């Protein structure tokens, strides 16, 4: 199948400069249009910029918003779509796809999320959440892991390695004072937990951090 | 440039149902004979747009016929025929008849339940995070619909209003409930000479507040 997929976000200062990449393949990259589009809350989807063919002599066209400050530019021998951003504003952050596009398609990355901000890195810490004691209440069981006090995102969570996705809910993080949290809750049969083990896998790439958390019966 | 007015933002429908979203440009997006460059899009939580709908009414390579596009003058509209689960997520028109191109704001699609009361759990602080001078009480409220509720903490019988953090998931593409998780954070201080700690939620399944509790001393 055709594939895409960006990289290069990350967190950058007010005024700072970055370099998205976007590589291509399942299709003649050369052939075709290439934009990059970003998204956020604030703005919904909005087209960034785009370069068209050699024949066209790499013609590019640009937002408003972005003209001489980013530049698209294309590889076409290593199937490569360049993003280069300067001067960048706490407005300019979002997720950046790159999306390749002809009459009678159009298919998009995955995105990369850039984050303008000032405020600086921090690790998340990773609590266990276990059920109050008891005796086996109900059928069922439901654990948790609450992903706290990081920056910026993303983090990765998984339960058993991925093993384990029913019964998940995974909640978007919250954004306050410049730090995010997250939780997450698993719900299995009450037989399976504690017999079983349950672990709350989190990567915190900006940081560095990976953990995993076993949760223990109070 | 071409303003693209998409309406309506929420749309509630039932399994089976059809489904209609508009878009209105606010100029002709003919770009040339048999070609007007409107397209649909489909954004599921969690992932990238999908195509839907090119050239107006052209279904894209995989996409099912009950879905369908049309246009005339500069109105447009998907139509969603025999809606399932899966279906769920936010809806875009996208304009590549003119630079700069130009999305819709999107249309939520909201799949029509059965009601169902959220079952609620209850978490006190771990003894890791003790151990560092904080202490968060979770509760969450899981598989409920419709998607409002309320959530009131209280300590030994007081409602705590400050301190509170709450975030929903999307409507789940299986059984199409909400999720709701609500953490309280306090000093390990002010938590250490409180007892009781409530999870209390209203909900319009039930008159009564569905309540979740535990005792410091207890566990």
């Known amino acids: 199948e055709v594939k895409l997929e960006e990289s290069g976000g990350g967190l950058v200062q007010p005024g700072g400069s970055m370099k998205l990449s976007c590589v291509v393949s399942?299709?003649?990259?050369?052939?075709?249009?290439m934009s990059w589009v970003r998204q956020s809350p604030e703005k919904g989807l909005e087209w960034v910029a785009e370069i068209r063919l050699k024949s066209d002599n790499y013609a590019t066209h640009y937002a408003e918003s972005v003209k001489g400050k980013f530049t698209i530019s294309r590889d076409d021998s290593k199937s490569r779509l360049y993003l280069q951003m300067n001067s960048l504003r706490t407005e300019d952050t979002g997720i950046y796809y790159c999306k390749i596009y002809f009459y009678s398609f159009s298919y998009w990355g995955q995105g990369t999320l850039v984050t303008v901000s000032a405020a600086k890195t921090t690790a998340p810490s990773v609590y266990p959440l276990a059920p109050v004691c008891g005796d086996t209440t109900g059928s069922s069981v439901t654990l948790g892991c609450l992903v706290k006090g990081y920056f910026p995102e993303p983090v990765t969570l998984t339960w058993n390695s991925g093993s384990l996705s029913s019964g998940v809910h995974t909640f978007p993080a919250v954004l306050q004072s410049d730090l995010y949290t997250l939780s997450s809750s698993v719900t299995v049969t009450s037989s399976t937990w504690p017999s079983q083990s349950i672990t709350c896998n989190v990567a915190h790439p900006a940081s560095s951090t990976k953990v995993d958390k076993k949760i223990e019966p109070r | 440039e071409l303003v693209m007015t998409q309406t309506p933002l929420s749309l509630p429908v039932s399994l089976g149902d059809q489904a209609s979203i508009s878009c209105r440009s606010s100029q002709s997006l003919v770009h040339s004979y048999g070609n007007t460059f409107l397209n649909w899009y489909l954004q599921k939580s969690g992932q990238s747009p999908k195509l839907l709908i090119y050239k107006v009414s052209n279904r894209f390579s995989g996409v099912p016929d009950r879905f369908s596009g049309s246009g005339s003058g500069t109105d447009f509209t998907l139509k969603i025929s025999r809606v399932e689960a899966e279906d769920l997520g936010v809806y875009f028109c996208?304009?590549?008849?003119?630079?700069?191109?130009?999305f819709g704001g999107g249309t939520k699609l909201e799949i029509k339940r059965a009601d169902a009361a959220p079952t609620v759990s209850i978490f006190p602080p771990s003894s890791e995070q003790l151990t560092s001078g904080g202490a968060s009480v979770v509760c969450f409220l899981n598989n409920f619909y419709p998607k409002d509720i309320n959530v009131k903490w209280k300590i030994d019988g007081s409602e705590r209003q400050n301190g509170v953090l709450n975030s929903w998931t999307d409507q789940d593409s299986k059984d199409s409930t909400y999720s709701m998780s609500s953490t309280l954070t306090l000093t390990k201080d002010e938590y250490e000479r409180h007892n009781s700690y409530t999870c209390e939620a209203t909900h319009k399944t039930s008159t009564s507040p569905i309540v979740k509790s535990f005792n410091r001393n207890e566990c």
């Open positions: 399942g299709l003649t990259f050369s052939r075709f249009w």
């Open positions: 996208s304009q590549g008849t003119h630079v700069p191109y130009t």
